[PDB]
Design an enzyme around this catalytic site. Structure first.
Site, PDB file in Angstrom:
ATOM      1  N   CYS A 241      18.414 -37.691  -1.860  1.00  0.00           N
ATOM      2  CA  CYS A 241      18.853 -36.563  -2.056  1.00  0.00           C
ATOM      3  C   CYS A 241      20.057 -36.502  -2.806  1.00  0.00           C
ATOM      4  O   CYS A 241      20.200 -37.075  -3.721  1.00  0.00           O
ATOM      5  CB  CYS A 241      18.702 -35.989  -0.693  1.00  0.00           C
ATOM      6  SG  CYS A 241      19.085 -36.831   0.678  1.00  0.00           S
TER       7      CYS A 241
ATOM      8  N   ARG B 281      18.248 -34.913   4.059  1.00  0.00           N
ATOM      9  CA  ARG B 281      16.920 -34.425   3.350  1.00  0.00           C
ATOM     10  C   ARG B 281      15.828 -35.591   3.150  1.00  0.00           C
ATOM     11  O   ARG B 281      14.876 -35.566   3.430  1.00  0.00           O
ATOM     12  CB  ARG B 281      17.150 -33.322   2.027  1.00  0.00           C
ATOM     13  CG  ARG B 281      17.940 -32.231   2.377  1.00  0.00           C
ATOM     14  CD  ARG B 281      18.369 -31.375   1.408  1.00  0.00           C
ATOM     15  NE  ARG B 281      19.563 -32.022   0.684  1.00  0.00           N
ATOM     16  CZ  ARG B 281      20.252 -31.753  -0.436  1.00  0.00           C
ATOM     17  NH1 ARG B 281      19.691 -30.523  -0.969  1.00  0.00           N
ATOM     18  NH2 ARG B 281      21.083 -32.407  -1.031  1.00  0.00           N
TER      19      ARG B 281
HETATM   20  C1  LIG Z   1      32.712 -38.134   1.787  1.00  0.00           C
HETATM   21  C2  LIG Z   1      32.652 -37.059   3.060  1.00  0.00           C
HETATM   22  O1  LIG Z   1      31.464 -36.463   2.782  1.00  0.00           O
HETATM   23  C3  LIG Z   1      30.591 -36.002   3.791  1.00  0.00           C
HETATM   24  O2  LIG Z   1      30.869 -36.524   4.987  1.00  0.00           O
HETATM   25  C4  LIG Z   1      29.233 -35.241   3.453  1.00  0.00           C
HETATM   26  C5  LIG Z   1      29.635 -34.221   2.779  1.00  0.00           C
HETATM   27  C6  LIG Z   1      30.386 -32.961   3.296  1.00  0.00           C
HETATM   28  N1  LIG Z   1      30.595 -31.820   2.094  1.00  0.00           N
HETATM   29  C7  LIG Z   1      29.897 -30.769   2.077  1.00  0.00           C
HETATM   30  O3  LIG Z   1      28.929 -30.504   2.716  1.00  0.00           O
HETATM   31  O4  LIG Z   1      30.097 -29.995   0.905  1.00  0.00           O
HETATM   32  C8  LIG Z   1      29.509 -28.505   0.861  1.00  0.00           C
HETATM   33  C9  LIG Z   1      29.398 -27.907   2.323  1.00  0.00           C
HETATM   34  C10 LIG Z   1      30.591 -27.560  -0.064  1.00  0.00           C
HETATM   35  C11 LIG Z   1      28.324 -28.703   0.167  1.00  0.00           C
HETATM   36  C12 LIG Z   1      28.365 -36.419   3.085  1.00  0.00           C
HETATM   37  C13 LIG Z   1      26.898 -35.777   2.828  1.00  0.00           C
HETATM   38  C14 LIG Z   1      26.405 -35.037   1.870  1.00  0.00           C
HETATM   39  C15 LIG Z   1      25.188 -34.451   1.814  1.00  0.00           C
HETATM   40  C16 LIG Z   1      24.472 -34.755   2.727  1.00  0.00           C
HETATM   41  N2  LIG Z   1      22.988 -34.389   2.733  1.00  0.00           N
HETATM   42  S1  LIG Z   1      21.884 -35.193   2.069  1.00  0.00           S
HETATM   43  O5  LIG Z   1      22.180 -34.950   0.479  1.00  0.00           O
HETATM   44  O6  LIG Z   1      20.610 -34.235   2.578  1.00  0.00           O
HETATM   45  O7  LIG Z   1      21.846 -36.281   2.468  1.00  0.00           O
HETATM   46  C17 LIG Z   1      24.765 -35.810   3.930  1.00  0.00           C
HETATM   47  C18 LIG Z   1      26.134 -36.141   3.953  1.00  0.00           C
HETATM   48  C19 LIG Z   1      28.756 -34.778   4.953  1.00  0.00           C
HETATM   49  O8  LIG Z   1      28.499 -33.677   5.205  1.00  0.00           O
HETATM   50  O9  LIG Z   1      28.512 -35.784   6.098  1.00  0.00           O
HETATM   51  C20 LIG Z   1      27.888 -35.508   7.230  1.00  0.00           C
HETATM   52  C21 LIG Z   1      27.767 -36.800   7.882  1.00  0.00           C
END
Ligand SMILES: CCOC(=O)C(CCNC(=O)OC(C)(C)C)(Cc1ccc(NS(=O)(=O)O)cc1)C(=O)OCC
Ligand SMILES: [Cl-]
Ligand SMILES: [Cl-]
Ligand SMILES: [Mg+2]
Ligand SMILES: [Mg+2]
EC number: 3.1.3.48
Length: 288
Positions: free
Chosen positions: A222, A228
């Site tokens: 993802c 996801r």
């Molecule tokens: C480097 C630091 O980033 C994180 O911690 C992330 C992303 C946070 N940013 C974010 O959500 O931006 C918008 C809301 C504007 C889209 C890294 C991340 C990004 C996407 C996902 N979903 S996945 O693509 O379905 O894995 C999971 C983790 C995070 O949220 O970590 C959670 C543990």
């Protein structure tokens, strides 16, 4: 807890109990998963030379389960997930970056991957979440030492299936066909609009795998390769349980993924969604 099996005949009521008092027991379970796997090193991933190869600096593969590229820089943000019967059923990885597109296809080639599942859009809420790592048109491109050509693109209502041919440049005769399954309707940190859609997508991919006369590991990615991606693989495993056993173990499925990569099934909503998919399959089955 390593496992919480539920007899299928008890699932409907058990799920209503889990949802009682504002998902109180479901939240308690999800929280128990919080630290699973976290007693492992992310040392290679944390090297300064590998820093720019990680999309999200908090989301790193464990040393014990990382995928190694051949040669002098062996690093990619990707993790092996073992199967119930043999290692390396899946490789889970982040959406490739401009500087990791070649590494992604090198991993594909070296690990004998024939099927790729992508469960993100490239751009979401105005942010790049995954770079467009395959050809834009029908012309061949080199990615490092591999040549990639798109053969077909079939847009369906909720996912698009693409077929590529990939050649090592030193042996153009020895090509491989790669199938790429791109589910186009899953918001980041969220869930698809229906259980039916993801259940059918997972069954579809599983059917294609089962006719890929054994391939290598299936790649699933993802943006970060945890939320996801984890929910997809969890649902694949749970649906296989429902076809084989008279109990289902959603907690155990997510637990086992967390042993191999951080944050697999990254939100409580996603964990609830897995229960709704099981509920829905079982409701149908009860009357048939
Ligand atoms: C480097 C630091 O980033 C994180 O911690 C992330 C992303 C946070 N940013 C974010 O959500 O931006 C918008 C809301 C504007 C889209 C890294 C991340 C990004 C996407 C996902 N979903 S996945 O693509 O379905 O894995 C999971 C983790 C995070 O949220 O970590 C959670 C543990
Ligand atoms: Cl493995
Ligand atoms: Cl297996
Ligand atoms: Mg490089
Ligand atoms: Mg290049």
């Amino acid at each position: 807890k390593t496992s919480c099996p539920i007899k299928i005949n008890q699932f409907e009521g058990h799920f209503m109990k889990l949802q009682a008092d504002s998902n109180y027991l479901l939240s308690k379970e999800y929280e128990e998963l919080k630290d699973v796997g976290r007693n492992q090193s992310c040392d290679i991933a944390l090297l300064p030379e590998n820093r720019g190869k990680n999309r999200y600096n908090n989301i790193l593969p464990y040393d014990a389960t990382r995928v190694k590229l051949s040669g002098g820089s062996d690093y990619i943000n990707a993790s092996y997930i073992p199967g119930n019967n043999f290692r390396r059923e899946y490789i889970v990885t982040q959406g490739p970056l401009p500087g990791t597109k070649d590494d992604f296809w090198k991993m594909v080639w070296e690990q004998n991957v024939h099927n790729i599942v992508m469960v993100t859009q490239c751009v979401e809420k105005g942010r790049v979440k995954c770079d467009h790592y395959w050809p834009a048109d029908q012309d061949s491109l080199y990615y490092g030492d591999l040549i990639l050509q798109m053969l077909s693109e079939s847009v369906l209502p909720e996912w698009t299936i693409r077929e590529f041919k990939i050649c090592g440049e030193e042996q153009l005769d020895a090509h491989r066909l790669i199938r790429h399954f791109h589910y186009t309707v899953w918001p980041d940190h969220g869930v698809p609009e229906t259980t039916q859609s993801l259940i059918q997508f997972v069954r579809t991919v599983r059917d294609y795998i089962n006719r890929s006369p054994g391939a290598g590991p299936t790649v699933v990615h993802c943006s970060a390769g945890v939320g996801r991606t984890g929910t997809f693989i969890a649902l694949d495993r749970i649906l296989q349980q429902l076809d084989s056993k008279d109990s289902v173990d959603i907690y155990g499925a997510v637990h086992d993924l967390r042993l191999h990569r951080v944050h697999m099934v990254q939100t409580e909503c996603q964990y609830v969604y897995l229960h709704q998919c099981v509920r829905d399959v079982l409701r149908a089955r009860k009357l048939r």
